[PDB]
């Protein structure tokens, strides 16, 4: 009963793109799940403060972007931003 959601399957898909012939133990998958949850919370948290500071009721991709710039190290942020911008674009183009 009461299903527990996790990013296990989506993490598995990404693994196959990067290393088609590589597996991952259960304990390793659990760590990855913690990682995605942790980062989601840190980014959402910063974005939350950003909207509040600027008296905005909405968290848009703009807040997510600034949050990423605040949270991630130099290069990692650069690519995360480009990946994010790319996904929003591909998305707006139906």
């Amino acid at each position: 009963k009461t299903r527990k959601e996790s990013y296990a399957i989506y993490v598995y898909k990404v693994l196959k793109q990067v290393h088609p012939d590589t597996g991952i133990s259960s304990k390793a998958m659990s760590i990855m799940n913690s990682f995605v949850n942790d980062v989601f919370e840190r980014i959402a948290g910063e974005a939350s403060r950003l909207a509040h500071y600027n008296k905005r009721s909405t968290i848009t991709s703009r807040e997510i972007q600034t949050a990423v710039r605040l949270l991630l190290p130099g290069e990692l942020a650069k690519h995360a931003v480009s990946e994010g911008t790319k996904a929003v674009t591909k998305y707006t183009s139906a």
């Binding site: 980014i43 909207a51 190290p73 990692l76 790319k86 929003v88």
Partner: protein, 103 residues
């Protein structure tokens, strides 16, 4: 699905739901979950990429916690990002202060 529209493996729909149910803001725009899902996917690819190499560099095809630790701590930025994180069963990087070596 929204993820397919964005060209992502990570669940946009779910991310959207999570943002909303997390009380981060009164409202959540449509683009926020897309951008966020993509960032989460990219960071995931990055660690798996380096962790996979650690498994290969160790003659193993299955990624274990050990491999995640090696990939994170040997990478300046990931190490920084996870500077206050403890990866269970990760151990530490082999490192001995020179002054302690024989002779």
């Amino acid at each position: 699905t929204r993820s397919s529209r964005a060209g992502l493996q990570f669940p946009v729909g779910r991310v959207h739901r999570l943002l909303r149910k997390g009380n981060y803001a009164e409202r959540v725009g449509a683009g926020a979950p897309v951008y966020l899902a993509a960032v989460l996917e990219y960071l995931t690819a990055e660690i798996l990429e380096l962790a996979g190499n650690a498994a290969r560099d160790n003659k193993k095809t299955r990624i274990i916690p050990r491999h995640l630790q090696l990939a994170v701590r040997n990478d300046e930025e990931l190490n920084k990002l996870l500077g206050r994180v403890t990866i269970a069963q990760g151990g530490v990087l082999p490192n001995i202060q020179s002054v302690l070596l024989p002779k």
